[PDB]
Design a binder for this molecule. Structure first.
Ligand SMILES: CCCCCCCCCCCCCCCCCC(=O)OC[C@H](CO[C@@H]1O[C@H](CO[C@H]2O[C@H](CO)[C@H](O)[C@H](O)[C@H]2O)[C@H](O)[C@H](O)[C@H]1O)OC(=O)CCCCCCCCCCCCCCCCC
Ligand SMILES: CCCCCCCCCCCCCCCCCC(=O)OC[C@H](CO[C@@H]1O[C@H](CO[C@H]2O[C@H](CO)[C@H](O)[C@H](O)[C@H]2O)[C@H](O)[C@H](O)[C@H]1O)OC(=O)CCCCCCCCCCCCCCCCC
Ligand SMILES: CCCCCCCCCCCCCCCCCC(=O)OC[C@H](CO[C@@H]1O[C@H](CO[C@H]2O[C@H](CO)[C@H](O)[C@H](O)[C@H]2O)[C@H](O)[C@H](O)[C@H]1O)OC(=O)CCCCCCCCCCCCCCCCC
Ligand code: CLA
Ligand code: CLA
Ligand code: CLA
Ligand SMILES: CCCCCCCCCCCCCCCCCC(=O)OC[C@H](CO[C@@H]1O[C@H](CO)[C@H](O)[C@H](O)[C@H]1O)OC(=O)CCCCCCCCCCCCCCCCC
Ligand SMILES: CCCCCCCCCCCCCCCC(=O)OC[C@H](COP(=O)(O)OC[C@@H](O)CO)OC(=O)CCCCCCCCCCCCCCC
Ligand code: HEM
Ligand SMILES: CC1=C(/C=C/C(C)=C/C=C/C(C)=C/C=C/C=C(C)/C=C/C=C(C)/C=C/C2=C(C)CCCC2(C)C)C(C)(C)CCC1
Ligand SMILES: CC1=C(/C=C/C(C)=C/C=C\C(C)=C/C=C/C=C(C)/C=C\C=C(C)\C=C\C2=C(C)CCCC2(C)C)C(C)(C)CCC1
Ligand code: OEX
Ligand SMILES: [Cl-]
Ligand SMILES: [Fe+3]
Lengths: 58, 141, 33, 93, 134, 334, 37, 254, 102, 53, 105, 59
């Protein structure tokens, strides 16, 4: 039960619609892109520092 | 066999400072010419800031003259401490110790006349701390 | 190259643990309490 | 924008392209970052590559330090989305 | 391991051999005198100049050797050699303003600056990179 | 006989349907205005600038927001921990943009369960019994003080507190474990042993009663109809359920004193939620969890990762992506 | 550090704060020796 | 409430009271400020405070009806005024006395709320102001006026709720990967909410001195500012806004 | 290609050794190597675009993000009003029903 | 007063524990000192600028 | 970082921060000139190394631009790195930092 | 001076005998009605030796 498809269509069709659910999806793409080079080393994830989703200033 | 050590034996992971004492000399000299000139350099700077306080008493803006006595002159009591423990004789050291103490006492009475918004009382505590600043500098040479 | 500090820290810990149950161990022995 | 054709000049290569490049892109050249690139992001050269050597408030030994790296600078049309974060950029190590 | 700690002494490529003691002396003194601002080669209060192997080489004295780093802690300059950043950075010259520099010798500046050059030889991507290599 | 004593003996009267005692003079009007603002601002609140960065978050039922996404959003971070009631706003909708509904609910709810806790004392006085059900309610009240008040006290603004919503609690937990490492804190470690342990002993003690009932009932009807309410005798053999569990583990691992057994039910989850409520409040002042990042090193000094580093790569990924444009400087609140 | 006369006693004052933990644990030893009566 | 009445107050009695953003008046008339053609000059301390935010909205929108500026209500806080917008005044166009923008707090990001519940955000700024006035004297008249370029509200490194941005960010709606998997005429082309455009527009101002003092303390006058609002990096159309409050300045001789 | 375990994946280009060459980055400022920096060209083969090759840097990024999904296909999605998130096969729906009933 | 003795015995033994691990180059807060900042607030040993002698 | 980017030649007001607000200098809800960023919640700070830069209406934009004396940059760079943020095993950091310092405040 | 050094070392030796043997002597069934100024002698020489250590610290 990953996403509410009613609110992913809306947040793509409105760039000022935001909820704590929509903030929870961006936290999941932080976890899945930073941990993946270290958690699953057999896959050889060689993500550079420019393509992983960082926020701003940290 | 693993190289194990018991309560000492300073390898790369031993957290003990009973070894590893200093070998060479302390290359920071404690009171040399280069920072004593810097203490004379900030006494040129701090005397200009207490000179600058007179126009802000006349403008009656308190948070400048309560702040400009902390802005550049924060390292003034530290530098006045370092100058009086640099002189040679002891009976000239009393003359610099006393008017450093009469400076500090004069300075915060100017601050007590700054928070209470007392223009007529802060102008005499400014001039008393000013001539105690010039009495300090010919006491330390 | 002897440590001489945690020797002194643990020989004084052995003094300290031999204080609390040195009161009670003599008091159990002498019927007091 | 989503597509921008001048992304290979903003760092991570040579050819810094002074008009919209960050201040920390001059770290990769020695003698370039702290105060000599003050006057490259302030009063910036929005004319050409050789407008940065005719710039003023430089010492003559600072003007020769730009001359070592004249081929590592271009001049691009100044996009306003990169001029705003020319000094901070939100990009710390 | 740790057989090669062959850091360069000055320019033109003369090297030196650190020894095991000067490395435990170096890491214990880099910590608690530097590493509250340099936790893994970053600079926390000025992050676009750090302790990289690349960024220390791209200075007006190149700081990839130990004799330009002994001259750093005795007399610091900026990143382009013009100014002298000594009132905002701890050094032997400014050890009155910075009390942590007051007691350490010249012989353990060699231990501290031996640690700045050893760390890219064993922790190459992690030393000086940010949190991405944590 | 007085004009006040006739009122004072109605408030402390046990003849009412719900007890309306002297702590209930404070918790009835405070919870009813923490209910009437919670029900309205869950349905029809406007979007709230939580971070003070002029980007509002829309967490009410009018603005989309199925109820595993809607929340009474916390206050603005430009407001901070400043007292923000209605009369200190220029207008009522200006009060709604900065998130004024969150301190109006959460200061009345916290003052309401603090006087629920005194009311749970108060009926145990007028009924003549031992009074420490107020102590057992002090574990949820502290845990509702830890996420709602003490974490906004230590961490600055009221925006760091828990959002009053279901998906807001999951956002509160991920942002907490990014910056405070609650999973490797040894007092949250005790609380999940009082939550799993309390859930064990509910399923353990509740099993051994219902598996040793004496049959005061027939076969086809329900089993619960054999306990007449208010009877004198016990409905289950304690000696048989002790002799069951003394064969399961061993004989002296089980309480055949049912008062010491039932105290152990009241001690294991209540002390555990007391230690969780401390841990979130000590992490509010940034005494974080354990940090075994990069501890294991080999002889050459190369960093060997352990299992606390793969937690840290999760902890760093939810650190860079929470508050994605609210940071301007490289360290988070340092 | 300590004054230079009392610098030898630095291993002595390293465990002296631990003694108020031992006073709590002394009461459980004294209760067990009398038999928890 | 002049400058000389405000500088005597401590910070402990200004903080919190809402008086720290109040654009200090003066009390003066029958004065002039002469600006020499050779000497250097600078405005300093140019505090600008608006009042009565008004957004232009359509009432008929077909024919025979105007665009009446509906009165709104302020929605953020008391964060709206500007402080210390110094700039050099000594340039002289065939007469005109113009001053260009130098530095200071040019902008203030506030939102106001239209009738209907819609909150429009806008960036009240005077950045790149070049305001000319006819004549060489200053006081009781001599209305300045010029164009200021506003920047956009969000910058290029403002990330969306779905992680899209101009300078940074994703370049696709990444939570809908099946819409990206189309090849022809359906490959997230429905969204140009993705391509974020940092667009820069211009606004006009006109300010009257409305009072003077011949020593210092230049105007404590009024201003009228027409301006566009936030476009959400090129997602929604901007509205016009009309601001009319009180500014104040101080000319020093340089 | 993105594996089955992920849901969002950065579109990185590799050679036959595993090493990166282009990445279409998240942070355009100081990106060391991008799609238009190294200048990758698409040469389509087979299908609807048999022989259509183009080196336009905006149009290379379009078919780069699609080809991490595995293969490019033209979808007719104005029929069932499709929403754009991947559903699950009856192979995977049976196993949800039968390993939860059992 | 046995227990008032063990409050003062903590204050005796911890303040000797703080000054044994002193290391005068570091500040008070870089060593985990908790009773020496209570005595430096009262002006014992503190000099100008915050350093202690 | 107000000091450092001013030393790189930026006008430190009119920052144009990323959300549209102030990056370095900002406006308080009561109308004072305060520091921008996440630190606007701590706007009511009275601290003896910055109160020589506050006028009556908050932080003065003229005293910041000129009289920003380097004992304050010493105390800012120390107090940023010596932040009350630690661990239970005494590791100084933001809880994702590698261990090389033992510092909890 | 090192004559102070053996004085305070004699204090920690004597107080080790004092802190053990005072609650042994009080809480025995005997030994308190017999030996009150065996404790107060030992408590007197303990308070005596602190004063002797006290003003020798000035020299
Ligand atoms: C006893 C007498 C009590 C009188 C209470 C009262 O006068 O109650 C008045 C309040 C409502 O006040 C109104 O509150 C409104 C709040 O607007 C917000 O809420 C509105 C709700 O439709 C819209 O959504 C609107 O867009 C949004 O901005 C506006 O600010 C109005 O100006 C203001 O008059 O009712 C309430 O609190 C409801 C109380 C339950
Ligand atoms: C049961 C729970 C019931 C809770 C009910 C809550 C609603 C009831 C009404 C309010 C009661 C207090 C709640 C708010 C407490 C708080 O915000 O407290 C914060 C204040 C400190 O205020 C701060 O004070 C600071 C002062 O600093 C200023 O001054 C300093 C000195 O000069 C510095 O210079 C500094 O630079 C300068 O900024 C700032 O102003 C901050 O903005 C300001 O937040 O603490 C203080 O006043 C002193 C301590 C107050 C008590 C705190 C207790 C918190 C509740 C504990 C409950 C435990 C539950 C246990 C289980 C049951
Ligand atoms: C059947 C029962 C079974 C057992 C279950 C019951 C368990 C009872 C509890 C036992 C817990 C203690 C175990 C020993 C802990 C320890 O050895 O701990 C080690 C430390 C001392 O170790 C030293 O710790 C030092 C820490 O100093 C560092 O840190 C300092 C301050 O942070 C400074 O920053 C300074 O820079 C730096 O030197 C160094 O790391 C040294 O190398 C190291 O030797 O002992 C100490 O301090 C301990 C001192 C007492 C602490 C007092 C409480 C303070 C915190 C209260 C609030 C926390 C609430 C949440 C908690 C959950
Ligand atoms: C049980 C009664 C009760 C209590 C204790 C509170 C308590 C509170 N209400 Mg509240 N309220 C109530 C009933 C109650 N309410 C009811 C019935 C309504 C509906 C009309 C409201 C409607 C309401 C609104 C609309 C608001 C509050 C707000 C508040 C808070 C501050 C109010 C204030 O300054 O008080 C003033 C109190 C005093 C001057 C007394 C101080 C001295 C006494 C003796 C206490 C001292 C304690 C101790 C000795 C120290 C506070 C938490 C405000 C808020 O949101 O806060 C964040 C707010 O805006 N209330
Ligand atoms: C293989 C089965 C198994 C076993 C033996 C344990 C055992 C344990 N877990 Mg664990 N756990 C399990 C599965 C298991 N767990 C699963 C499937 C999950 C969900 C992913 C968790 C999630 C979990 C968390 C989050 C934590 C534990 C903790 C613990 C420890 C104390 C818990 C406790 O006292 O419970 C009560 C039991 C009795 C009182 C008896 C204990 C070592 C906690 C810990 O760290 O403590 C050391 C802790 O923080 N576990
Ligand atoms: C298997 C894994 C596991 C388990 C068992 C737990 C267990 C727990 N976590 Mg935890 N956590 C986990 C994983 C886990 N966590 C992970 C992976 C993370 C990282 C993402 C976290 C992050 C995390 C955080 C950040 C926090 C916890 C907290 C807690 C505690 C919550 C229960 C509690 O104290 O509420 C106690 C009960 C209440 C708060 C309810 C109060 C009830 C009030 C008084 C009245 C109710 C009002 C109500 C409306 C009336 C009803 C209406 C009526 C009409 C019926 C509990 C110990 C919290 C904690 O310990 O502190 C609070 C906490 O803050 N966890
Ligand atoms: C909220 C308060 C509630 C009460 C909480 C406190 C009580 C809880 C128990 C915690 C205390 C446990 C005992 C003390 C441990 C730390 C002592 C220590 O080693 O200091 C550790 C310090 C380390 O010294 C360090 O030095 C550095 C200098 O480079 C720095 O100055 C550091 O700041 C300094 O901490 O000193 C020692 O090394 C002493 C070692 C002596 C070896 C024997 C010690 C034996 C102590 C434990 C005895 C058993 C008792 C355990 C409890 C039994 C019941 C479970
Ligand atoms: C003890 C019994 C008290 C009476 C019964 C309780 C009724 C509960 C009402 C429901 C909650 C309402 C919450 C307000 C919801 C709310 O936020 O309202 C706010 C509301 C909005 O104000 P505006 O935004 O219109 O402000 C005007 C400006 O915008 C104009 O420029 O203010 C009012 O209109 C007045 C409302 C209070 C008027 C109350 C009456 C005042 C008389 C006081 C009499 C005291 C004597 C009493 C003797 C005991
Ligand atoms: C053992 C002690 C230290 C060593 C070896 C050390 C080493 C260095 C070196 C080599 C540089 C580069 C200088 C340059 O390239 O211009 C540097 C920069 C810097 N260090 Fe340190 N450092 C030490 C202590 C500290 C401490 C404690 C601080 C924190 C107050 C600090 C703050 C800085 C800053 C801010 C810079 C950047 C200077 C700039 O931006 O121009 N240093 N450090
Ligand atoms: C000079 C000096 C010194 C020394 C000192 C000394 C020697 C001291 C002594 C001290 C002492 C000698 C102390 C003691 C104390 C004690 C106490 C304070 C006690 C308390 C007790 C208690 C608390 C008890 C309780 C109880 C009871 C009542 C009964 C049963 C139970 C119990 C056990 C709990 C040194 C060298 C270190 C250093 C330098 C300085
Ligand atoms: C000042 C000083 C001193 C003093 C000291 C003291 C005052 C001590 C005390 C006290 C103490 C030191 C006490 C002790 C304690 C002990 C121990 C040893 C601990 C613990 C134990 C335990 C823990 C056990 C327990 C148990 C039991 C038996 C019962 C139940 C079960 C259990 C297991 C729990 C002297 C003179 C030496 C000199 C030097 C310095
Ligand atoms: O908003 Mn809620 O939050 Ca826990 O941090 Mn500080 O402020 Mn934001 O941060 Mn990273
Ligand atoms: Cl920030
Ligand atoms: Fe039962």
């Amino acid at each position: 039960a990953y996403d509410f498809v009613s609110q992913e269509l809306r947040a793509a069709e409105d760039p000022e619609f935001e909820t704590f659910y929509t903030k929870n999806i961006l936290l999941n793409e932080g976890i899945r892109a930073w941990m993946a080079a270290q958690d699953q080393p057999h896959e050889n994830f060689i993500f550079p520092e420019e393509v992983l989703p960082r926020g701003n200033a940290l | 066999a693993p190289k194990q050590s018991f309560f000492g034996g300073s390898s790369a992971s031993s957290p003990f400072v009973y070894n590893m004492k200093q070998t060479g000399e302390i290359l920071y000299k404690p009171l040399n010419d280069e920072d004593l000139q810097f203490h004379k350099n900030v006494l040129e700077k701090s005397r200009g800031e207490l000179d600058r306080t007179s126009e802000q008493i006349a403008r009656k803006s308190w948070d400048d003259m309560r702040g400009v006595i902390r802005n550049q002159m924060y390292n003034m009591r530290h530098s006045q401490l370092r100058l009086i423990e640099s002189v040679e004789s002891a009976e000239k050291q009393k003359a610099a110790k006393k008017n450093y103490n009469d400076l500090k006492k004069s300075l915060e009475e100017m601050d007590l006349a700054a928070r209470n918004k007392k223009q007529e009382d802060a102008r005499k505590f400014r001039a008393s701390a000013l001539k105690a600043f010039d009495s300090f500098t010919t006491s330390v040479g | 190259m002897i440590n001489w500090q945690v020797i002194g820290q643990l020989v004084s810990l052995a003094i300290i643990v031999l204080v609390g149950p040195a009161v009670i161990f003599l008091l159990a022995f002498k019927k007091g309490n | 924008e989503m597509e921008y054709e001048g992304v290979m000049y903003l760092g991570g290569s040579d050819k810094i392209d002074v008009n919209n490049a960050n201040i920390r892109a001059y770290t990769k050249y020695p003698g370039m970052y702290p105060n000599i690139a003050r006057e490259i992001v302030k009063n910036g050269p929005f004319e050409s590559v050789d407008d940065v050597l005719k710039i003023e408030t430089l010492t003559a030994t600072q003007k020769s330090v730009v001359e070592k790296y004249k081929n590592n600078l271009i001049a691009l049309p100044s996009r306003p989305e990169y001029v705003i974060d020319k000094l901070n950029n939100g990009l710390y190590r | 391991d740790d057989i090669t700690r062959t850091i360069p002494l000055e320019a033109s490529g003369t090297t030196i051999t650190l020894t095991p003691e000067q490395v435990k002396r170096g890491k214990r003194l880099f910590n608690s005198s530097c590493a509250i601002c340099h936790n893994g080669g970053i600079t926390k209060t000025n992050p676009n100049v750090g302790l990289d192997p690349e960024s220390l080489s791209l200075a007006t004295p190149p700081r990839d050797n130990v004799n330009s780093l002994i001259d750093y802690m005795k007399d610091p300059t900026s990143y382009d050699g013009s100014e002298s950043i000594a009132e905002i950075h701890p050094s032997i010259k400014s050890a009155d303003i910075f009390p942590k520099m007051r007691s350490l010798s010249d012989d353990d500046l060699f231990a501290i600056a031996g640690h700045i050059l050893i760390q890219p030889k064993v922790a190459s991507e992690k030393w000086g990179g940010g949190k991405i290599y944590y | 006989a007085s004009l006040w004593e006739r009122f004072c003996s109605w408030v402390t009267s046990t003849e009412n349907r719900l007890y309306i005692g002297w702590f209930g003079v404070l918790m009835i009007p405070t919870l009813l205005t923490a209910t009437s603002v919670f029900i309205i601002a869950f349905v029809a609140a406007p979007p709230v600038d939580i971070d003070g960065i002029r980007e509002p978050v829309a967490g009410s039922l009018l603005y989309g927001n199925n109820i595993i996404s809607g929340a009474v959003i916390p206050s603005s971070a430009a407001i901070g921990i400043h007292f923000y009631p209605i009369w200190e706003a220029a207008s009522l909708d200006e009060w709604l943009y900065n998130g004024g509904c969150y301190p109006l609910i959460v200061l009345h709810f916290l003052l309401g369960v603090a006087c629920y806790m005194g009311r749970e004392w108060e009926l145990s006085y007028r009924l003549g019994m031992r009074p420490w059900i107020a102590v057992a309610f002090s574990a949820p009240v502290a845990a509702a003080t830890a996420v709602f008040l003490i974490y906004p006290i230590g961490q600055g603004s009221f925006s760091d507190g828990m959002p009053l919503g279901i998906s807001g609690t999951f956002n509160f937990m991920i942002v907490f474990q990014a910056e405070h490492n609650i999973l490797m804190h040894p007092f949250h470690q005790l609380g999940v042993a009082g939550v799993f342990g309390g859930s064990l002993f509910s399923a353990m003690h509740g099993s051994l009663v219902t598996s040793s009932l004496i049959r005061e009932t027939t076969e086809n009807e329900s089993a619960n109809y054999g306990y007449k309410f208010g009877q004198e005798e016990e409905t289950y053999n304690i000696v048989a359920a002790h002799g069951y569990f003394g064969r399961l583990i061993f004989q002296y691992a089980s309480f055949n004193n049912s008062r010491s057994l039932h105290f152990f039910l009241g001690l294991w989850p209540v002390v555990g939620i007391w230690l969780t409520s401390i841990s979130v409040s000590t992490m509010a002042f940034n005494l974080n969890g354990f940090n075994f990042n990069q501890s294991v090193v080999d002889s050459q000094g190369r960093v060997i990762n352990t299992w606390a580093d793969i937690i840290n790569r999760a902890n760093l990924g939810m650190e860079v992506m929470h508050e994605r444009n609210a940071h301007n400087f490289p360290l988070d609140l340092a | 550090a300590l004054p230079e006369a009392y610098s030898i006693f630095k291993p002595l004052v390293d465990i002296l704060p631990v003694i108020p933990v031992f006073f709590l644990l002394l009461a459980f030893v004294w209760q067990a020796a009398i038999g928890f009566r | 409430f002049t400058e000389e009445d405000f500088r005597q107050l401590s910070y402990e009695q200004v903080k919190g009271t809402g008086l720290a953003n109040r654009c200090p008046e003066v009390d003066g008339t029958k004065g002039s400020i002469k600006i020499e053609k050779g000497k250097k000059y600078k405005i300093v301390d140019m505090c600008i405070e608006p009042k009565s935010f008004q957004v232009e909205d359509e009432v008929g929108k077909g024919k025979q009806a105007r665009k009446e500026f509906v009165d709104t209500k302020l929605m953020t806080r008391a964060t709206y005024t500007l402080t210390g917008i110094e700039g050099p005044l000594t340039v002289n166009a065939n007469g005109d006395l113009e001053f260009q923008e130098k530095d200071g707090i040019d902008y203030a990001a506030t939102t106001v709320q239209l009738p209907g519940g819609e909150r429009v955000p806008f960036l009240f700024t005077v950045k790149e102001l070049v305001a000319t006035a006819k004549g060489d004297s200053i006081g009781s008249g001599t209305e300045f006026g010029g164009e200021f370029t506003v920047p956009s509200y969000r910058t290029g490194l403002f990330l969306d709720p779905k992680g899209r941005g101009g300078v940074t960010g994703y370049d696709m709606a990444v939570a809908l990967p099946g819409m990206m998997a189309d090849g022809a005429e359906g490959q997230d082309e429905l969204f140009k909410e993705t391509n974020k455009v940092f667009q820069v527009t211009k606004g006009e101002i006109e300010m009257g001195v409305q009072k003077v003092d011949p020593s210092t303390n230049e105007i404590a006058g009024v201003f009228v500012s027409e301006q566009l609002t936030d476009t959400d990096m090129g997602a929604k159309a901007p509205k016009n806004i009309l601001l009319k409050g009180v500014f104040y300045a101080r000319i020093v001789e340089e | 290609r993105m594996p089955a375990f992920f849901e969002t994946f950065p579109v990185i280009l590799v050679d036959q050794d595993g090493i990166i060459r282009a990445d279409i980055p998240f942070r355009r400022a100081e990106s060391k190597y991008s799609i238009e920096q190294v200048g990758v060209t698409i040469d389509f083969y087979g299908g609807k675009l048999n022989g259509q090759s183009f080196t336009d840097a905006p149009t290379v990024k379009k078919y780069a993000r699609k080809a991490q999904l595995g293969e490019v296909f033209e979808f007719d999605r104005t029929t069932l009003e499709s929403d754009g998130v991947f559903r699950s096969s009856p192979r995977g729906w049976y196993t949800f029903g039968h390993a939860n009933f059992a | 007063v046995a227990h008032a003795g063990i409050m003062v015995f903590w204050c005796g033994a911890m303040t000797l524990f703080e000054v044994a691990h002193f290391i005068p180059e570091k500040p008070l807060y870089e060593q985990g000192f908790i009773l020496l900042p209570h005595l430096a607030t009262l002006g014992w040993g503190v000099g100008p600028g915050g350093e202690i002698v | 970082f107000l000091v450092r980017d001013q030393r790189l030649g930026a006008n430190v007001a009119s920052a144009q921060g990323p959300t549209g607000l102030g990056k370095y200098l900002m406006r308080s809800p009561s109308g004072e000139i305060i520091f921008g960023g996440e630190t606007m919640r701590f706007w009511d700070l009275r601290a003896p190394w910055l109160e020589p830069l506050r006028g009556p209406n908050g932080l003065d934009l003229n005293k910041i631009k000129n009289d920003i004396q380097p004992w304050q940059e010493r105390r800012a760079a120390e107090y940023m790195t010596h932040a009350p943020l630690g661990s239970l095993n005494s590791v100084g950091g933001v809880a994702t930092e590698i261990n090389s310092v033992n510092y909890v405040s | 001076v090192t004559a102070l050094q053996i004085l305070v070392f004699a204090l920690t030796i004597l107080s080790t005998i004092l802190v053990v043997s005072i609650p042994v002597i009080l809480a025995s069934p005997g030994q308190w009605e017999q030996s009150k100024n065996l404790v107060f002698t030992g408590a007197g020489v303990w308070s005596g030796l602190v004063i002797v250590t006290g003003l020798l610290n000035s020299f």
